[PDB]
RNA sequence: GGAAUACUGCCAGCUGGGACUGAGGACUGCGACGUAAGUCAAGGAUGCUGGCAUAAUGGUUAUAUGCCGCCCGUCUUGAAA
RNA sequence: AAAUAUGUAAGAAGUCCUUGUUACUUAAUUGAACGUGGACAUUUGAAUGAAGAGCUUUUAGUGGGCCAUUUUUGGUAAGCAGAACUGGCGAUGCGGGAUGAACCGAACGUAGAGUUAAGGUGCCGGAAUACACGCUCAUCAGACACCACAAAAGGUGUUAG
RNA sequence: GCCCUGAAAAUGGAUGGCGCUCAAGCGUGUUACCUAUACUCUACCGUCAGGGUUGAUAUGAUGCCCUGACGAGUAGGCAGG
RNA sequence: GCAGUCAAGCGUUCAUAGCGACAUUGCUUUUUGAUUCUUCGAUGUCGGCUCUUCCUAUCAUACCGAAGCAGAAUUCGGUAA
RNA sequence: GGUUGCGGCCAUAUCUACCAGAAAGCACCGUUUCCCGUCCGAUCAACUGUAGUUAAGCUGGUAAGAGCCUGACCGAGUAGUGUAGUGGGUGACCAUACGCGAAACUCAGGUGCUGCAAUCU
């Protein structure tokens, strides 16, 4: 906040660091999808409509999001959203099984080797990204969101968010969506 | 709906009990499903599986295959296990002492093994002596020895063996077997 | 009675049902087609190195 | 009738480069090829002997043999639903060491060394490649740089 | 495309070897949110300079609020727009209380009269007309007379209930 | 010049109305409130009260009413044809 | 000379040090193959995923296909003939397009509560005869993708330019 | 731009119908609302997977038990009845 | 088969009263073809006779507009089946 | 730095015209007994390094030179193209969204670099 105020004061422009994290929601059904984006949709663990996952933004994931774009709607999650998403809908993957994160014991049992021995340890490793994001985030089952309570705000979903809504990078706006899907 | 990546409701390709109805066999099986469940000891978990196998997957361990396996260094005092039956081999003369746990022994096999001053015990007899497989030396027979597998992979240039009911010259020996009759395989 | 002549329609789908993989690599692979006289002499370097390493067992 | 001869369809593939015809220079004969070497294939149409078939044009494989005037390359060819393994006998004029393979080895050496210097201080390394990260914050200054502000341009024909 | 907003969008080519600190460019953009604003920056910046956003960055986004939002004024609007058969330049006047208002009705108008959707319209320049009677188009000029007043004949009151027990009057 | 307010976002802020569900069946887990005894909304509903007896309730059947439903079998790219 | 497609590589079957074998090879204890002994196991050498990997045997049905976007050959053309990649129909109901193989949405165990999609909300018909700025009057108006057609040409209608 | 002319076919008929003219038409924007066998939570059936459990302890060890996921189907294969 | 746009020409003179070349936009499905979707366990295959009804691109009849309409005769066009 | 022998890459090295080049080298050049080849000692072969000369080869310099090479917000984000929509249009076709992106043009710079060995005012 104050970095921006100071650069302004000095007649410059503070420019933020590009976002290290995105959350992704598949908003397309499963049939009539072309092989390539279809494949990508799976490797991002997004194989049913309205499921979601977090992605670390680097060049090599950035081009996945490109390839997959008219099927998903994504952006940058707030702490608030990441917190409610894991609390309400966070399940862990253990011996192939999908287990709810009812107690902190469950996470430590599995992520303890990496640090991470509470749910907010998990959240932290997600929003800050870094060290064991791979593992912590993979530990999280894809989130099974509902349809948005209050609608999609748009006449038709399968245009770009810029074109008249849904699909593509809606940036910050992702949060309002996911909050009605959560 | 779910874009499946995997066949749903697929069962493991693995036997889970023996196919047999042999009362006694289901008891051995009942033994080691306990031993393998309630111990670690890799050995039990193996025999428990080996019990489910079919007669092809349990080819005979020979008496000489045992005699040789004992020539291994630090072997001679181990007790060789054969979850299957042990046959006799006329071709070794010197046959050592040692105690052999199997499922079945042919007449001549426990003959050899005993007369050499050695023992022939059933598996559950083994189970009590060695609940954790102590000094056991598991042995498996030559699977790929069957007459059946000679024909597997039969094809041009595959070098395999035709399914020919009655052999000789005049029996699939001409065109396609020699450069002089059409060509060669 | 003319009938359809050709296509590769579906043939990809078919190939990818249980297909592609690659084709199985092996340290110590098939000396099929490798230069005979190189091989011949290689048989003898091999006999030697082994025979030589017998000079440590006795 | 249809025609499917051995060099069919290769009017431009086996063509010489523009103003690069005639004599193949002597660098091509001085290069040395070992087994396990990784080579690109690219036929020289003036060297009609030991050409690759047109399929293998642009494919890259491993040397399994070094004969007098040729190498044997192993190519994995897709046929049906499985990869099949192919033995090729190419004269040296149709072969080329792979650059990306030579860069790999350089990075192996580079990796050994970085590892030396690091361990010769017991310190950590990170020897493996990370992909292009986001971007940290910046502060652009406005001195000498008061934003020229642009706008869209009207339509205008000119024929 | 909704409730419009005006944005100062500022960006520059990414820094390099030879040009540490390149030149900043600014646009004013009527879009309905930031994500569109920044995208419409890069749209034009491709067409004017030859930057692609892959090789550039967005230094600042600022919302330009209207100075005197409760002062009625006369805006002149310059427009480039695409038709079913050609692409043309326009000038029109819009009387309103804010820049953002002016644009909304511009965009509506282009759409009613010439069937021009948002995509087929570049906004060239929008500028308050300081000196009255620089006002060029009549449909505005007729509101600029001294002591302007008009009636609003035939007034149709919307009914709540479906039956009414009196024959209505249109009598404003 | 000093304020408000809109817009946007956050609260592990408080709170009213309506709806569907109540799987499980000794204990065991993680907790919370307590100075403690002890209490609790903490690994799935209990309490209080009323109604029904030639009846409440339910199954079946007939009919009516709202919406929906072409003839099976076959060959076929395609059948109510 | 693009775009899109397309080969290979990103290490333990690896790296370095010492020096052993041979009949091959070198002017040559030179090489080339293959090894002994020693050293390096934190990121062992990009990302993401892995619902487990590998593998063997045997056998059914099929071997008339058709459709859509795009590429595209023949033809004046065709609901015509013929190829290309993918997705469909065929084998598949369900919600939408009144109607309908193939479009849009979405794929199906028996159910409850919620939210939606594509598509709709005057009445038939569940759902604003909602809000807002314009445009249009047709003695042949018009009314929504696929789709159930319209052209050269023209108007002192009217609107904006 | 919209409208008018250019604009001719055979039973009587089709923006789906009625009907609609500051629309119930055309272009655009903003909200709310209706609705799938899809999405979210829950029960139950089955299938598959992973575990636990006869140490002596009334009547099912191919059984009991805990947990997770999944369910379209012609020709056709197999299994259980 | 039928109808347009252009206007070089024809028409004593005069493009368009009536025509209209070189080109070019269309419409029609009583021509002929192209295709092979429907019917090969069967839709009786030309002409005429008889009778009804429909289309209009109107031959006559009604009322008009036009002319290279003096009159008579005619020709072009409209509303008209 | 010059030069020569053997080269690498193979025009920034080629082409046209005109100047210049010390020293060494290279060359042209002298000769026909011998080996050797020609219609022809021209080429090829041998002999001398002796009679001669930088005239040419060669080497550099010159040129709003031809070609070639490099670059550029020069054209141009043009043409073309991957993906998206129940986008526009009667249609040919077009625009928008996430991306890639030329050629012709214009202008600016350049005109061999380099390895082994011998040698030189
Ligand atoms: Mg609400
Ligand atoms: Mg609601
Ligand atoms: Mg909106
Ligand atoms: Mg919700
Ligand atoms: Mg035999
Ligand atoms: Mg053989
Ligand atoms: Mg035929
Ligand atoms: Mg056909
Ligand atoms: Mg066929
Ligand atoms: Mg041909
Ligand atoms: Mg060719
Ligand atoms: Mg090339
Ligand atoms: Mg030859
Ligand atoms: Mg245009
Ligand atoms: Mg435009
Ligand atoms: Mg709150
Ligand atoms: Mg209960
Ligand atoms: Mg009753
Ligand atoms: Mg019905
Ligand atoms: Mg029937
Ligand atoms: Mg048929
Ligand atoms: Mg039928
Ligand atoms: Mg590939
Ligand atoms: Mg088969
Ligand atoms: Mg078969
Ligand atoms: Mg067959
Ligand atoms: Mg395609
Ligand atoms: Mg399709
Ligand atoms: Mg069929
Ligand atoms: Mg379907
Ligand atoms: Mg329709
Ligand atoms: Mg689509
Ligand atoms: Mg809609
Ligand atoms: Mg009705
Ligand atoms: Mg209603
Ligand atoms: Mg009128
Ligand atoms: Mg359209
Ligand atoms: Mg007009
Ligand atoms: Mg007519
Ligand atoms: Mg109509
Ligand atoms: Mg229209
Ligand atoms: Mg409207
Ligand atoms: Mg719209
Ligand atoms: Mg609207
Ligand atoms: Mg259901
Ligand atoms: Mg089923
Ligand atoms: Mg005249
Ligand atoms: Mg004339
Ligand atoms: Mg005439
Ligand atoms: Mg026919
Ligand atoms: Mg019939
Ligand atoms: Mg009949
Ligand atoms: Mg008859
Ligand atoms: Mg008429
Ligand atoms: Mg008239
Ligand atoms: Mg006259
Ligand atoms: Mg007369
Ligand atoms: Mg007369
Ligand atoms: Mg007359
Ligand atoms: Mg006429
Ligand atoms: Mg009549
Ligand atoms: Mg002579
Ligand atoms: Mg001479
Ligand atoms: Mg000579
Ligand atoms: Mg020279
Ligand atoms: Mg020049
Ligand atoms: Mg264009
Ligand atoms: Mg394109
Ligand atoms: Mg759609
Ligand atoms: Mg249309
Ligand atoms: Mg285009």
Structural commentary:
This is part of a larger assembly, with chains A (182 residues), B (185 residues), C (58 residues), D (159 residues) and E (172 residues). In chain A, 38% of the residues lie in helices and 17% in strands. Chain A has 182 residues and is an alpha+beta fold. The radius of gyration of chain A is 17 Å and the shape is globular. The relative contact order of chain A is 0.17. Chain B has 185 residues and is α/β, with parallel strands linked by helices. Chain B contains five helices and five strands. Chain B has helices spanning 23-38, 42-50, 63-70, 107-115, 123-129; strands at residues 61-62, 79-87, 99-105, 119-121, 136-138. In chain B, strands 1, 2, 3, 4 and 5 form a five-stranded parallel beta sheet that branches. The longest helix of chain B is centred in the N-terminal third of the chain and has 16 residues, at 23-38. Chain B is flat, with a radius of gyration of 22 Å. Chain C has 58 residues and is mainly alpha-helical. Chain C has helices at residues 11-15, 36-54. The longest helix of chain C is centred in the last third of the chain and has 19 residues, at 36-54. In chain D, strands 4-3-2-1-5 form a five-stranded antiparallel beta sheet. Helices cover 16% and strands 25% of the residues of chain D. With 159 residues, chain D is α+β, with helices and mostly antiparallel strands. Chain D has helices spanning 27-30, 99-119, and strands at residues 38-41, 60-66, 70-79, 82-91, 95-97, 138-140, 148-149. Classes of the chains: A alpha+beta (182), B alpha/beta (185), C mainly alpha (58), D alpha+beta (159), E alpha+beta (172). Chains D and E meet through strand 7 of D and strand 2, helix 1, strand 5 and strand 6 of E. Bound molecules: magnesium ion (71 copies). Residues 82, 120, 122 of chain E line the site of one magnesium ion. One magnesium ion binds next to loops of chain D. The structure holds five RNA strands. Chain B: Belongs to the eukaryotic ribosomal protein eL18 family. Chain B: It is found in: Cytoplasm. Chain B: Its main location: cytoplasm. Chain B: Pfam families: Ribosomal_L18. Chain B: This is Large ribosomal subunit protein eL18A.
